[PDB]
């Protein structure tokens, strides 16, 4: 059923809350035993948001391999994503270790360091060229190379150096800076523009490791980003673009990380970004 018509039918009936609860009820439940070990309590930002054991990213160290991060593997779309929480003061070194080990090209950040007067994630990248960051626990160095500040997002070029081998890589930081403190954006225009800039970079391409995507918990805004991307890529690839069922795509993604899309408003917004993206590829 054309997701456009399904969208008007839900809006006219005001049933967003009822669709959203049906998704929550049918979503997968898998064990997260590593996340709940006592040695990992300070590695988790939220007690109710954990990676499943089957899909968690492992750090390449014998001490403790745990990070709050999940590999989303979309078989039909041939797209992969690492969804993770905003780094904590004691997990900034782990975060950059994961970027290095997974061979990611891009980091996508969908939150501000402070929102609603509280800290949502650590200041985990350098703000001045001449003041680099060293992570002594994981033996990495991170330098700001350049910064391009636009109205709705900032793109940064970073240099990550493995101090053990003296290899360096260029990492692109895509920072969406205008998501509102409450609710969702009124138009998906600036979000959809951001996604297309991420893609243009090569960060979402198979010659690199998976893109790292985060917000504060790594499930809400982060969920919207990967759902929108996968949706639009399937429409490009299938003989019948109207066969793309956003609710079925979201349940497949929830096999890999719990809680993706946190509210009925984010579901509606996810619907709108895809419908608007659809109504733009066609040349509306
Ligand atoms: N940005 N990099 C990636 O998405 C990626 C990273 C590692 C391996 C493959 C990747 O994509 C292609 C692909 C996706 C899902 C299944 C099969 C193949």
CSV table of C-alpha atoms and ligand atoms in Angstrom, one decimal:
chain,number,residue,atom,x,y,z
A,1,UNK,CA,0.0,0.0,0.0
A,2,UNK,CA,1.6,3.3,-1.2
A,3,UNK,CA,3.2,4.6,2.1
A,4,UNK,CA,1.9,8.1,1.0
A,5,UNK,CA,-1.8,7.0,1.3
A,6,UNK,CA,-1.1,4.9,4.4
A,7,UNK,CA,0.4,8.2,5.8
A,8,UNK,CA,-2.8,10.3,5.1
A,9,UNK,CA,-5.0,7.4,6.5
A,10,UNK,CA,-3.0,7.3,9.8
A,11,UNK,CA,-2.9,11.2,10.0
A,12,UNK,CA,-6.7,11.6,9.3
A,13,UNK,CA,-7.5,8.8,11.9
A,14,UNK,CA,-4.9,10.2,14.4
A,15,UNK,CA,-3.6,6.6,15.1
A,16,UNK,CA,0.2,7.3,15.2
A,17,UNK,CA,0.3,6.1,18.9
A,18,UNK,CA,-1.5,2.8,18.0
A,19,UNK,CA,0.8,2.0,15.0
A,20,UNK,CA,3.9,2.8,17.2
A,21,UNK,CA,2.7,0.5,20.1
A,22,UNK,CA,2.1,-2.4,17.5
A,23,UNK,CA,5.8,-2.1,16.5
A,24,UNK,CA,6.9,-2.1,20.1
A,25,UNK,CA,4.8,-5.3,20.8
A,26,UNK,CA,6.2,-7.2,17.7
A,27,UNK,CA,9.9,-6.1,18.1
A,28,UNK,CA,12.5,-8.8,18.7
A,29,UNK,CA,13.9,-9.6,22.2
A,30,UNK,CA,17.4,-11.1,22.4
A,31,UNK,CA,19.8,-11.4,25.4
A,32,UNK,CA,22.1,-8.5,26.4
A,33,UNK,CA,24.1,-10.4,29.0
A,34,UNK,CA,27.5,-8.8,28.4
A,35,UNK,CA,26.0,-5.2,28.7
A,36,UNK,CA,24.6,-6.1,32.2
A,37,UNK,CA,27.9,-7.5,33.7
A,38,UNK,CA,28.8,-5.4,36.8
A,39,UNK,CA,32.3,-4.5,35.3
A,40,UNK,CA,30.4,-2.7,32.4
A,41,UNK,CA,28.0,-0.5,34.5
A,42,UNK,CA,30.1,2.7,33.9
A,43,UNK,CA,30.3,1.9,30.1
A,44,UNK,CA,26.5,2.4,29.7
A,45,UNK,CA,24.8,5.8,29.6
A,46,UNK,CA,21.2,4.5,30.1
A,47,UNK,CA,20.3,1.3,32.1
A,48,UNK,CA,17.4,0.4,29.7
A,49,UNK,CA,19.5,0.8,26.4
A,50,UNK,CA,21.9,-2.2,25.7
A,51,UNK,CA,23.3,-3.8,22.6
A,52,UNK,CA,22.2,-7.5,22.0
A,53,UNK,CA,25.0,-10.0,22.5
A,54,UNK,CA,24.5,-11.4,18.9
A,55,UNK,CA,25.1,-8.0,17.1
A,56,UNK,CA,27.3,-6.0,19.6
A,57,UNK,CA,30.7,-4.5,18.4
A,58,UNK,CA,33.7,-6.1,20.1
A,59,UNK,CA,36.8,-4.0,20.9
A,60,UNK,CA,40.1,-5.9,19.9
A,61,UNK,CA,41.6,-6.1,23.4
A,62,UNK,CA,41.8,-9.0,25.9
A,63,UNK,CA,41.1,-6.8,29.0
A,64,UNK,CA,37.4,-5.9,28.3
A,65,UNK,CA,36.0,-6.0,24.8
A,66,UNK,CA,32.7,-4.2,25.7
A,67,UNK,CA,31.2,-1.0,24.1
A,68,UNK,CA,27.5,0.1,23.9
A,69,UNK,CA,27.4,-0.3,20.0
A,70,UNK,CA,25.6,-2.6,17.6
A,71,UNK,CA,26.3,-3.5,13.9
A,72,UNK,CA,23.0,-3.1,11.9
A,73,UNK,CA,23.4,-5.4,8.8
A,74,UNK,CA,20.7,-4.8,6.1
A,75,UNK,CA,21.0,-7.9,3.7
A,76,UNK,CA,18.5,-6.7,0.9
A,77,UNK,CA,19.8,-3.1,0.8
A,78,UNK,CA,23.6,-4.1,1.1
A,79,UNK,CA,24.0,-1.2,3.7
A,80,UNK,CA,25.6,-1.6,7.2
A,81,UNK,CA,25.6,0.9,10.1
A,82,UNK,CA,27.2,0.9,13.6
A,83,UNK,CA,24.6,2.6,16.0
A,84,UNK,CA,26.2,3.6,19.4
A,85,UNK,CA,25.4,5.9,22.4
A,86,UNK,CA,27.0,9.3,22.8
A,87,UNK,CA,30.5,8.6,24.4
A,88,UNK,CA,30.9,9.0,28.2
A,89,UNK,CA,34.0,10.6,29.8
A,90,UNK,CA,35.4,7.1,30.5
A,91,UNK,CA,34.5,5.6,26.9
A,92,UNK,CA,35.9,8.4,24.6
A,93,UNK,CA,39.1,6.2,24.0
A,94,UNK,CA,36.9,3.1,23.4
A,95,UNK,CA,34.8,5.1,20.8
A,96,UNK,CA,37.9,6.0,18.7
A,97,UNK,CA,39.4,2.5,19.1
A,98,UNK,CA,36.1,1.2,17.5
A,99,UNK,CA,36.3,3.8,14.6
A,100,UNK,CA,39.9,2.6,14.0
A,101,UNK,CA,39.3,-1.2,14.3
A,102,UNK,CA,36.1,-1.2,12.1
A,103,UNK,CA,37.8,1.0,9.4
A,104,UNK,CA,34.9,3.6,9.4
A,105,UNK,CA,35.3,6.7,7.2
A,106,UNK,CA,32.5,8.8,8.8
A,107,UNK,CA,31.0,9.6,12.2
A,108,UNK,CA,27.4,11.0,12.1
A,109,UNK,CA,26.4,13.0,15.3
A,110,UNK,CA,22.7,14.0,15.6
A,111,UNK,CA,22.8,15.8,19.0
A,112,UNK,CA,24.4,18.8,20.8
A,113,UNK,CA,26.9,18.2,23.7
A,114,UNK,CA,24.4,20.1,25.9
A,115,UNK,CA,20.6,19.9,25.4
A,116,UNK,CA,17.8,20.8,27.9
A,117,UNK,CA,20.6,22.2,30.3
A,118,UNK,CA,22.2,18.7,30.7
A,119,UNK,CA,25.3,17.0,29.1
A,120,UNK,CA,24.1,14.4,26.4
A,121,UNK,CA,27.7,13.3,25.4
A,122,UNK,CA,31.4,14.0,26.1
A,123,UNK,CA,33.3,16.7,24.1
A,124,UNK,CA,35.1,13.8,22.2
A,125,UNK,CA,36.8,15.7,19.3
A,126,UNK,CA,39.2,18.7,19.3
A,127,UNK,CA,37.8,22.2,18.8
A,128,UNK,CA,41.1,23.9,17.8
A,129,UNK,CA,43.7,22.8,15.2
A,130,UNK,CA,46.6,23.5,17.6
A,131,UNK,CA,45.1,21.6,20.6
A,132,UNK,CA,45.0,17.9,19.6
A,133,UNK,CA,43.6,15.1,21.9
A,134,UNK,CA,45.5,12.0,23.0
A,135,UNK,CA,43.6,8.9,24.4
A,136,UNK,CA,46.3,7.2,26.5
A,137,UNK,CA,44.1,4.1,27.4
A,138,UNK,CA,43.8,3.2,23.6
A,139,UNK,CA,47.0,4.8,22.2
A,140,UNK,CA,45.3,7.1,19.6
A,141,UNK,CA,45.8,10.8,18.6
A,142,UNK,CA,43.1,13.0,17.1
A,143,UNK,CA,43.7,16.4,15.4
A,144,UNK,CA,41.2,18.9,13.9
A,145,UNK,CA,42.3,19.5,10.3
A,146,UNK,CA,39.4,21.8,9.1
A,147,UNK,CA,35.8,22.8,9.9
A,148,UNK,CA,32.9,23.9,7.6
A,149,UNK,CA,30.0,25.4,9.6
A,150,UNK,CA,26.7,25.7,7.8
A,151,UNK,CA,23.2,26.8,9.0
A,152,UNK,CA,21.8,23.2,9.8
A,153,UNK,CA,25.1,21.1,10.1
A,154,UNK,CA,28.9,21.3,10.5
A,155,UNK,CA,31.4,19.0,8.6
A,156,UNK,CA,34.8,18.5,10.1
A,157,UNK,CA,37.9,16.8,8.7
A,158,UNK,CA,39.8,14.9,11.5
A,159,UNK,CA,43.1,13.0,11.5
A,160,UNK,CA,43.2,9.8,13.6
A,161,UNK,CA,46.7,8.4,14.3
A,162,UNK,CA,47.3,4.9,15.7
A,163,UNK,CA,50.3,5.9,17.9
A,164,UNK,CA,51.4,2.1,18.0
A,165,UNK,CA,52.0,1.9,14.2
A,166,UNK,CA,52.1,5.7,13.2
A,167,UNK,CA,49.4,4.9,10.5
A,168,UNK,CA,47.0,7.9,10.0
A,169,UNK,CA,43.5,8.1,8.5
A,170,UNK,CA,41.2,11.0,7.5
A,171,UNK,CA,37.7,10.7,9.4
A,172,UNK,CA,34.8,13.0,8.4
A,173,UNK,CA,32.6,14.2,11.2
A,174,UNK,CA,29.0,15.0,10.1
A,175,UNK,CA,27.3,17.0,12.9
A,176,UNK,CA,23.6,17.8,12.5
A,177,UNK,CA,23.3,20.8,15.0
A,178,UNK,CA,19.6,21.9,14.7
A,179,UNK,CA,17.4,19.0,15.9
A,180,UNK,CA,15.1,20.7,18.4
A,181,UNK,CA,15.4,20.0,22.2
A,182,UNK,CA,11.7,18.8,22.2
A,183,UNK,CA,9.7,17.0,19.4
A,184,UNK,CA,11.0,16.5,15.8
A,185,UNK,CA,11.7,19.0,12.9
A,186,UNK,CA,8.6,20.5,11.2
A,187,UNK,CA,10.0,19.8,7.7
A,188,UNK,CA,12.4,16.9,6.8
A,189,UNK,CA,14.2,19.2,4.2
A,190,UNK,CA,17.3,19.9,6.2
A,191,UNK,CA,17.6,16.3,7.6
A,192,UNK,CA,17.2,14.8,4.0
A,193,UNK,CA,19.9,17.4,2.7
A,194,UNK,CA,22.2,16.2,5.5
A,195,UNK,CA,21.8,12.4,4.6
A,196,UNK,CA,22.6,13.2,0.9
A,197,UNK,CA,25.8,15.1,2.0
A,198,UNK,CA,26.8,12.0,4.2
A,199,UNK,CA,26.3,9.8,1.1
A,200,UNK,CA,28.2,12.2,-1.3
A,201,UNK,CA,31.2,11.8,1.0
A,202,UNK,CA,31.7,8.1,0.4
A,203,UNK,CA,31.1,7.4,4.2
A,204,UNK,CA,28.1,5.0,3.5
A,205,UNK,CA,30.0,3.1,0.7
A,206,UNK,CA,31.2,-0.5,0.7
A,207,UNK,CA,35.0,0.3,0.2
A,208,UNK,CA,35.0,1.6,3.8
A,209,UNK,CA,33.9,0.0,7.2
A,210,UNK,CA,30.4,0.9,8.5
A,211,UNK,CA,29.5,4.5,9.3
A,212,UNK,CA,29.3,5.2,13.1
A,213,UNK,CA,26.0,6.9,14.0
A,214,UNK,CA,25.0,8.3,17.4
A,215,UNK,CA,22.7,10.6,19.3
A,216,UNK,CA,22.5,10.4,23.2
A,217,UNK,CA,21.1,6.8,23.5
A,218,UNK,CA,21.9,5.7,19.9
A,219,UNK,CA,18.3,4.6,19.2
A,220,UNK,CA,16.0,7.6,18.5
A,221,UNK,CA,17.4,10.2,16.0
A,222,UNK,CA,20.1,7.5,15.1
A,223,UNK,CA,17.2,5.1,14.2
A,224,UNK,CA,15.6,7.8,12.0
A,225,UNK,CA,18.8,8.4,10.1
A,226,UNK,CA,19.4,4.6,9.1
A,227,UNK,CA,15.6,3.9,8.6
A,228,UNK,CA,15.4,6.8,6.1
A,229,UNK,CA,18.6,5.9,4.2
A,230,UNK,CA,17.7,2.1,3.9
A,231,UNK,CA,14.1,3.0,2.8
A,232,UNK,CA,15.2,5.3,0.0
A,233,UNK,CA,18.0,2.9,-1.2
A,234,UNK,CA,15.4,0.0,-1.4
A,235,UNK,CA,13.0,2.2,-3.5
A,236,UNK,CA,16.0,2.9,-6.0
A,237,UNK,CA,16.7,-0.9,-6.3
A,238,UNK,CA,13.3,-2.6,-6.5
A,239,UNK,CA,11.1,-2.9,-9.7
A,240,UNK,CA,8.1,-1.8,-7.5
A,241,UNK,CA,9.1,1.1,-5.2
A,242,UNK,CA,5.6,1.1,-3.6
A,243,UNK,CA,6.5,-2.4,-2.1
A,244,UNK,CA,8.8,-0.7,0.4
A,245,UNK,CA,7.0,-1.2,3.8
A,246,UNK,CA,8.7,1.2,6.4
A,247,UNK,CA,7.2,-0.7,9.3
A,248,UNK,CA,8.7,-4.0,8.0
A,249,UNK,CA,12.1,-2.3,7.5
A,250,UNK,CA,12.0,-0.9,11.1
A,251,UNK,CA,11.2,-4.4,12.5
A,252,UNK,CA,14.1,-6.0,10.6
A,253,UNK,CA,16.4,-3.2,12.0
A,254,UNK,CA,15.1,-3.9,15.5
A,255,UNK,CA,16.5,-7.4,15.2
A,256,UNK,CA,20.0,-5.8,15.5
A,257,UNK,CA,19.4,-3.0,18.2
A,258,UNK,CA,16.5,-2.5,20.6
A,259,UNK,CA,14.3,0.6,20.7
A,260,UNK,CA,15.1,2.1,17.3
A,261,UNK,CA,12.6,5.1,16.9
A,262,UNK,CA,11.7,6.2,20.5
A,263,UNK,CA,8.3,8.0,20.0
A,264,UNK,CA,5.2,8.1,17.7
A,265,UNK,CA,6.4,11.6,16.5
A,266,UNK,CA,9.8,10.1,15.3
A,267,UNK,CA,7.8,7.4,13.4
A,268,UNK,CA,5.7,10.0,11.7
A,269,UNK,CA,8.8,12.1,11.0
A,270,UNK,CA,10.6,8.9,9.6
A,271,UNK,CA,7.5,8.4,7.4
A,272,UNK,CA,7.7,12.1,6.3
A,273,UNK,CA,11.5,12.2,5.5
A,274,UNK,CA,11.1,9.0,3.3
A,275,UNK,CA,7.8,10.2,1.6
A,276,UNK,CA,9.5,13.7,1.0
A,277,UNK,CA,12.7,12.0,-0.2
A,278,UNK,CA,10.5,9.7,-2.5
A,279,UNK,CA,8.6,12.9,-3.7
A,280,UNK,CA,12.0,14.5,-4.8
A,281,UNK,CA,13.8,11.6,-6.6
A,282,UNK,CA,10.6,11.4,-8.9
A,283,UNK,CA,11.0,15.2,-9.5
A,284,UNK,CA,7.9,16.4,-7.6
B,1,LIG,N1,30.1,1.7,4.5
B,1,LIG,N2,30.6,0.4,4.5
B,1,LIG,C1,29.6,-0.7,4.6
B,1,LIG,O1,28.4,-0.4,4.6
B,1,LIG,C2,30.2,-2.0,4.6
B,1,LIG,C3,31.2,-2.4,5.5
B,1,LIG,C4,31.7,-3.7,5.5
B,1,LIG,C5,31.1,-4.6,4.6
B,1,LIG,C6,30.1,-4.3,3.8
B,1,LIG,C7,29.6,-3.0,3.7
B,1,LIG,O2,28.6,-2.6,2.8
B,1,LIG,C8,28.1,-3.5,1.8
B,1,LIG,C9,27.2,-4.6,2.4
B,1,LIG,C10,26.3,-4.4,3.4
B,1,LIG,C11,25.5,-5.4,3.9
B,1,LIG,C12,25.7,-6.7,3.5
B,1,LIG,C13,26.7,-7.0,2.6
B,1,LIG,C14,27.4,-6.0,2.0
